[PDB]
Amino acid sequence: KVFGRCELAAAMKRHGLDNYRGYSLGDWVCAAKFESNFNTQATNRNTDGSTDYGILQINSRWWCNDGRTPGSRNLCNIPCSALLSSDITASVNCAKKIVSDGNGMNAWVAWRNRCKGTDVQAWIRGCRL
C-alpha cells in the first residue's frame, strides 16, 4: 500500500509514534518518505546480503527473519514479510525497539541524511490530526 502523507501521519499517531522517545510525528513521516516513499511493499537488498523491508526499511540482519540472512538476530521476532503489510502495526512495533536501541533515529540513514536538522514539521503541515 502507498500511503498518503496525512493518512500515514494519522496511522502513526494512532499507533503511538508521535513523540515516542522524543521524536516528533514529523520526524517519523519524514523518515518513511525518504526510506520507502510511503510504500509498505518497498524492499532493498544491501551489499552485506541483508535486505531492508517496508515503509521504514527495517533490516534483516538484526530485526526480522527473512530466511536468507546468515547471522540474523531477529530482534523483533517476526518474519520480514510481516513488515510489508498494508497494516503498519508490525513495522511500528519493531521501529519502537530500534529507536530505543541507544542511537535513536540515526539508525535510519535517510532520516540522518535528509530529515535530521530540517523543518520536519512541514511533513504533517495541513493534516487533520
Swiss-Prot record:
<feature type="disulfide bond">
    <location>
        <begin position="76"/>
        <end position="94"/>
    </location>
</feature>
<protein>
    <recommendedName>
        <fullName>Lysozyme C</fullName>
        <ecNumber>3.2.1.17</ecNumber>
    </recommendedName>
</protein>
<keyword id="KW-0732">Signal</keyword>
<feature type="disulfide bond">
    <location>
        <begin position="30"/>
        <end position="115"/>
    </location>
</feature>
<comment type="function">
    <text>Lysozymes have primarily a bacteriolytic function; those in tissues and body fluids are associated with the monocyte-macrophage system and enhance the activity of immunoagents. Has bacteriolytic activity against M.luteus.</text>
</comment>
<feature type="disulfide bond">
    <location>
        <begin position="6"/>
        <end position="127"/>
    </location>
</feature>
<dbReference type="GO" id="GO:0016998">
    <property type="term" value="P:cell wall macromolecule catabolic process"/>
</dbReference>
<dbReference type="GO" id="GO:0050830">
    <property type="term" value="P:defense response to Gram-positive bacterium"/>
</dbReference>
<feature type="disulfide bond">
    <location>
        <begin position="64"/>
        <end position="80"/>
    </location>
</feature>
<dbReference type="Pfam" id="PF00062">
    <property type="entry name" value="Lys"/>
</dbReference>
<keyword id="KW-0964">Secreted</keyword>
<dbReference type="GO" id="GO:0005615">
    <property type="term" value="C:extracellular space"/>
</dbReference>
<keyword id="KW-1015">Disulfide bond</keyword>
<keyword id="KW-0081">Bacteriolytic enzyme</keyword>
<dbReference type="GO" id="GO:0042742">
    <property type="term" value="P:defense response to bacterium"/>
</dbReference>
<dbReference type="GO" id="GO:0016231">
    <property type="term" value="F:beta-N-acetylglucosaminidase activity"/>
</dbReference>
<comment type="similarity">
    <text>Belongs to the glycosyl hydrolase 22 family.</text>
</comment>
<dbReference type="InterPro" id="IPR019799">
    <property type="entry name" value="Glyco_hydro_22_CS"/>
</dbReference>
<feature type="active site">
    <location>
        <position position="35"/>
    </location>
</feature>
<dbReference type="InterPro" id="IPR000974">
    <property type="entry name" value="Glyco_hydro_22_lys"/>
</dbReference>
<feature type="domain" description="C-type lysozyme">
    <location>
        <begin position="1"/>
        <end position="129"/>
    </location>
</feature>
<dbReference type="GO" id="GO:0042802">
    <property type="term" value="F:identical protein binding"/>
</dbReference>
<dbReference type="GO" id="GO:0003796">
    <property type="term" value="F:lysozyme activity"/>
</dbReference>
<dbReference type="GO" id="GO:0050829">
    <property type="term" value="P:defense response to Gram-negative bacterium"/>
</dbReference>
<keyword id="KW-0020">Allergen</keyword>
<keyword id="KW-0326">Glycosidase</keyword>
<feature type="active site">
    <location>
        <position position="52"/>
    </location>
</feature>
<dbReference type="GO" id="GO:0005783">
    <property type="term" value="C:endoplasmic reticulum"/>
</dbReference>
<keyword id="KW-0378">Hydrolase</keyword>
<dbReference type="GO" id="GO:0031640">
    <property type="term" value="P:killing of cells of another organism"/>
</dbReference>
<keyword id="KW-0929">Antimicrobial</keyword>
<dbReference type="GO" id="GO:0005737">
    <property type="term" value="C:cytoplasm"/>
</dbReference>
<comment type="subunit">
    <text>Monomer.</text>
</comment>
<dbReference type="InterPro" id="IPR023346">
    <property type="entry name" value="Lysozyme-like_dom_sf"/>
</dbReference>
<feature type="binding site">
    <location>
        <position position="101"/>
    </location>
    <ligand>
        <name>substrate</name>
    </ligand>
</feature>
<dbReference type="InterPro" id="IPR001916">
    <property type="entry name" value="Glyco_hydro_22"/>
</dbReference>
